[PDB]
Amino acid sequence: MIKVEIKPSQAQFTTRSGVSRQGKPYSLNEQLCYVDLGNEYPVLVKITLDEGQPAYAPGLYTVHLSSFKVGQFGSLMIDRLRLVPAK
Amino acid sequence: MIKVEIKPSQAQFTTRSGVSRQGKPYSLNEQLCYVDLGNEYPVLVKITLDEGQPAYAPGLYTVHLSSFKVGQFGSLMIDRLRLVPAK
């Protein structure tokens, strides 16, 4: 269904850091990817990885169901784009 | 990929109305559906239909690509859940 591609140039993540107003230090890993939305070319999208999972290796992926949740207004939302290998 | 179901009880939409601060009257059609997120049972989700399209008839659907857009923070978002028939 959605085609996602991690190029050889996108195999690394970068890390954002900080602290909650409640004192707690956070760390977020982000990686770029290409998502085919059916335009001329794929579009560049930023993924925030889950705690403890590595960067996705280059290759083709599709979107795992756990990426979605029902939002506070009763409509479907993406929580975090969670990927699985293509075949 | 995502399995969406319109039950016989969900074949109708309701209409919300109003006016923009800029003067313009709007009308929004909403319908309910069931989305399998892989829990025990499907979850109830509210759809806002596009201008001029009717209520989806009861049956099985999946999610059309045009439901997604890149949001203002560079991550993928759902714009409006747009459906297509299952086979």
Q: Evaluate whether B51 touches B62 at the Cβ level (below 8 Å).
A: no
Confirm if B46 and B29 have CB atoms less than 8 A apart.
no
On whether the CB atoms of residues A72 and A66 are closer than 8 A, the answer is: no
User: Which residues fall within 8 angstroms of residue A33, CB to CB, at 6 or more apart?
Assistant: A4, A5, A6, A7, A10, A44, A45, A46, A47, A56, A61
Contacts of B81 in chain A (CB under 8 A): 75-76
For residue A69, the one-letter residue type is K
Least Cα distance to A73 among B21, B16, B5, B8 occurs for: B16
Dihedral angle computed from the Cα positions of residues B5, A66, A36 and B28, in that order, rounded to the nearest 10 degrees: 50
Tell me which of A31, A73, A76 to substitute to probe the interface with B (most B C-beta atoms closer than 10 Å): A76
Which residues are CB-neighbours of B25 under 8 A, at least 6 positions away?
B17, B18, B19
Taking the domains of chain A in order of start, what are their residue ranges?
1-87
Out of B63, B70, B81, name the one closest to residue A43 (CB). B70
Say which DSSP state A8 is in: G
Give the resolution in Å.
1.6
PDB experimental method: X-ray
Rounded CA-CA distance A58/B12 in Å is 45
Within 13 Å and on the Cβ side, how many CA atoms surround B1? 18
C-alpha–C-alpha distance, residues A35 and B41, integer Å: 30
Q: What is the CATH number of domain B1-87?
A: 2.40.50.140
Is the Cβ–Cβ distance between A82 and A50 less than 8 Å?
Answer: yes
Distance of CA B59 to the CA centre of its chain: 14
B34: phi then psi, degrees, rounded to nearest 5: -115, 130
DSSP state of B56: P
Cβ neighbours of residue A70 closer than 8 Å, sequence gap 6 or more? A76, A77, B35, B37, B43, B44, B45
Q: Is B72 helix (H, G, I), strand (E, B) or coil?
A: coil
* Cα–Cα distance, B27 to B33 (Å, whole number): 20
* B47 neighbors B82 (Cβ within 8 angstroms): no
CA–CA gap between residue A68 and residue A84 (Å, rounded): 14
Q: Considering CB atoms only, which of A2, A76, A77 is closest to B65?
A: A2
- Nearest-angstrom CA–CA distance, B40 and B72: 34
Rounded to 10 degrees, what is the CA torsion of A2, B62, A73, B17?
Answer: 120
Question: What is the C-alpha to C-alpha distance for residues A11 and A36, in angstroms, rounded to an integer?
Answer: 18
